[PDB]
Amino acid sequence: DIVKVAIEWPGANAQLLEIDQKRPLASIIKEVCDGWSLPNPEYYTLRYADGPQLYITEQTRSDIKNGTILQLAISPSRAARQLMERTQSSNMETRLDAMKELAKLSADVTFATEFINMDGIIVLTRLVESGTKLLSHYSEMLAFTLTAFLELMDHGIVSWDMVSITFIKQIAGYVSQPMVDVSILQRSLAILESMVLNSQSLYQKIAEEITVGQLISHLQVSNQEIQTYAIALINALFLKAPEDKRQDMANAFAQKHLRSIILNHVIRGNRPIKTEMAHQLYVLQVLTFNLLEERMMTKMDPNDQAQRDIIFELRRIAFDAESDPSNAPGSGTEKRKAMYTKDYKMLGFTNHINPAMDFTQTPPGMLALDNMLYLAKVHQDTYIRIVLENSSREDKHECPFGRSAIELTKMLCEILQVGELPNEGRNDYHPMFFTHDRAFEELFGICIQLLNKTWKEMRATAEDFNKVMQVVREQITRALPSKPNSLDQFKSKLRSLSYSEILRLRQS
């Protein structure tokens, strides 16, 4: 086809051309240079005048729409060679302006490919590792160099394995040290993040050079952009951590108050939360919820006494206090088992005899058991009341704790999207999970109370089990878009969202 464009040249009138797409670029350029009386048309290449001003090749020339504004520019190969030479100049103002142009052009893959194939990567890292540090614009010069280096690496042409490890150690040292120039920190964080996300070997080297506290300390500053690349680097470490070692890493960051620091410095910060930051919060929240996946898909081993002891503990907390008689021995082994079995019926388990079988269902697996124990140990008052008010299965209107807690845990996993890998587009996150160290377990506690309130508000029976759960799912889902900044606020909206309320709201 034929596309009409205009091509510009500094200090001269633009040329209006009808581009024949069947015609070679070299021929077109030759004619253009003839119009402006320019020698050596082989020196030049077409380039967009506006926007990113990308170089144009024979493969990308299809995207040139009608009315596009182009510029006759120095060819990417010739420019790459000129700039690399100017970076080895005796004049330093020469090198600052050269490096500044490198920081701009390195984003263009057409230019980057040329510069990289001129041993460009090692040219830059060697400027960083042994440049002259005594001069007026050292930090400025370093910043542009790091910018150009990163943009070159982000084209997926050069493996991080080829990058000098002393260079990487130096960059990591900029992050671990008490304070560095703010722009140097940003470049360093961005580099380390990209290295982690795009390799395996180098990932192990970061945990050596930089401690958890040091990486978290970059969240305690006013600069929102710093905070953003700080969490980006943290999210990268979590994301590409081996399943083997993710839980320990989450513990290490938690024991140094990663959550509360983000809560106070970002969510409760002075300046508004920007789009880039909101995305990293989404990513972080997705990654933390994914920690539950292992336990969610972990089937209980009924033959493991250590796992059965957890259920024994649940039964013990519920039914065995000092107000109760002593099941002293003399009571047959068949008689003691009879009492245990009834307890498991009163606890609402399906398999009354061996309740461990209830947790072979994955999802929610052992995660449901962890939630029950958490409720029993942290909120005994709540656990006790729930199981005692719903003890007799003979009563048709009572709610089985076991069957409910298992289903609820499954339900909460679906709503929170546990076992999902974060995309690049989402910015949505639930703020209240940043307000407590065990937010998921607290959520279960609140929702199991909700479940019981909703159950008795519907005057439900065992036959209506699935119907109640459907209501509870809707109650929780409706309270979320209001985006509560605390678990108490979330609990408050649940109070208003009673069964009588939700029924009214689909009449609409």
Author numbering: 6 to 513
Excerpt from the paper describing this PDB structure:
Diffraction-quality crystals of ELMO-RAE belong to the C2221 space group. In the structure, the ELMO2-RAE forms an elongated superhelical architecture that consists of three domains: the N-terminal RBD domain (aa 1-80), the ARR domain (aa 81-301), and the ELMO domain (aa 306-513). The RBD domain adopts a typical ubiquitin-like superfold, which closely resembles the RBD of FHOD1, consistent with the previous bioinformatic analyses. The ARR domain contains five armadillo repeats (ARMs), though the ARM-1 is not complete. The ELMO domain has an all α-helical topology, composed of 11 α-helices. A Dali26 search suggests that the ELMO domain represent a novel fold with a global architecture. Notably, a 16-residue flexible loop (421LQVGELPNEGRNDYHP436) between α6 and α7 of the ELMO domain interacts tightly with the ARR domain (see below for the detail). In the RBD-ARR binding interface, Y60RBD inserted into the hydrophobic pocket formed by Pro81, Ala84, Leu88, Leu110, and Phe116 from ARR domain, which is similar to RBD-ARR interface occurred in FHOD1. The ARR-ELMO binding interface could be separated into two parts: (1) a 16-residue flexible loop between α6 and α7 of ELMO domain forms extensive hydrogen bonds with the residues from α14 of ARR domain, such as H284ARR-R431ELMO and N295ARR-E425ELMO interactions. (2) the distal side of ARR domain binds tightly to ELMO domain via extensive hydrophobic interactions. The second interface is further reinforced by additional polar interactions like R264ARR-D442 ELMO and R300ARR-D375ELMO pairs. It is worth noting that most of the residues involved in the binding interfaces are conserved among the ELMO family proteins, suggesting that the supramodular folding of RAE tandem is a common feature for all ELMOs.
In the present study, we perform a detailed biochemical characterization of the BAI1/ELMO2 interaction, and find that an evolutionarily conserved fragment located in the intracellular region of BAI1 specifically binds to the RBD-ARR-ELMO (RAE) tandem of ELMO2. To elucidate the assembly of BAI1/ELMO2 complex, we solve the crystal structures of the RAE tandem of ELMO2 and its complex with BAI1 at 2.5-Å and 1.7-Å resolutions, respectively. The RBD, ARR and ELMO domains of ELMO2 bind tightly and form a structural and functional supramodule, creating a highly conserved elongated concave groove capable of specifically binding to the BAI1 fragment. Each member consists of the Ras-binding domain (RBD), the armadillo repeats domain (ARR), the engulfment and motility (ELMO) domain, the pleckstrin homology (PH) domain and the C-terminal proline rich region (PRR).
